[PDB]
Design a protein around this ligand. Structure first.
Ligand SMILES: CC(=O)N[C@@H]1[C@@H](O[C@@H]2O[C@H](C(=O)O)[C@@H](O[C@@H]3O[C@H](CO)[C@@H](O)[C@H](O[C@@H]4O[C@H](C(=O)O)[C@@H](O[C@@H]5O[C@H](CO)[C@@H](O)[C@H](O[C@@H]6O[C@H](C(=O)O)[C@@H](O[C@@H]7O[C@H](CO)[C@@H](O)[C@H](O)[C@H]7NC(C)=O)[C@H](O)[C@H]6O)[C@H]5NC(C)=O)[C@H](O)[C@H]4O)[C@H]3NC(C)=O)[C@H](O)[C@H]2O)[C@H](O)[C@@H](CO)O[C@H]1O
Length: 149
């Protein structure tokens, strides 16, 4: 079983956390976004999302970097920084991910995610968990690198 907690989309950008813990490698992140018919966001896509209301208190991959979007300063979320905070120094390699779906609405979309449209055949029960608790499950796989499995 894999549980994927997903946020609202902001100009197509959303956050995904796997199994309630920082647990996604950079290769898994890319695979996960693809399974959502999405891509790792660019910095510019993130910046537009943050301008529309997107913030989290989680490190996650984008294309090229690990970031936290911050609107309000909070001392335990990117050490009180605002903006798209870029992680500079870390020993470790596993984070959450962000994803970008170009077909999402242009502003804030807090409707539930109901589908992992490009997951492939496989043995895993994958459950999408929305913040309101609504869940969607399917049997499949999305990880293409053996080292991530
Ligand atoms: C120093 C040093 O060594 N080097 C410097 C470096 O320091 C490092 O910085 C890191 C950093 O990023 O800051 C540090 O990492 C953090 O360490 C902490 C201690 O170990 C960790 O706790 C923290 O983990 C994160 O904790 C968060 C937390 O809040 O505990 C977690 O986020 C929460 O997740 C919850 C579940 O998803 C969310 O529900 C919650 O959101 C809040 O939820 C509220 C609620 O629902 O109750 C909600 O309140 C409601 O809001 C509505 C509408 O707004 C109101 O109307 C309603 O009434 C409210 N209800 C009420 C009143 O109850 C809130 O709005 C909402 O925020 C999440 N919390 C937040 C804040 O969003 C998160 O999941 C954990 O990951 C670590 N942080 C991270 C990011 O991992 C590290 O320890 C440091 O070493 C510096 O960063 C660097 C700077 O350059 O410099 C180095 O030198």
């Amino acid at each position: 079983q894999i549980d994927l907690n997903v946020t609202c989309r902001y100009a197509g950008v959303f956050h995904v956390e796997k199994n309630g813990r920082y647990s996604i490698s950079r290769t898994e992140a890319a695979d996960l976004c693809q399974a959502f018919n999405s891509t790792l966001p660019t910095m510019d896509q993130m910046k537009l999302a943050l301008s529309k209301g997107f913030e989290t208190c989680r490190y996650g991959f984008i294309e090229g970097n690990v970031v936290i979007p911050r609107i309000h300063p909070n001392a335990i979320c990117a050490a009180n920084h605002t903006g798209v905070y870029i992680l500079v120094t870390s020993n470790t390699s596993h984070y959450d991910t962000y994803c970008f779906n170009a077909s999402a609405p242009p502003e804030e979309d807090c409707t539930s995610v109901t589908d992992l449209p490009n997951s492939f055949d496989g043995p895993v029960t994958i459950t999408i968990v929305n913040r309101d608790g609504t869940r969607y499950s399917k049997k499949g796989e999305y990880r293409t690198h053996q080292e991530d499995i």
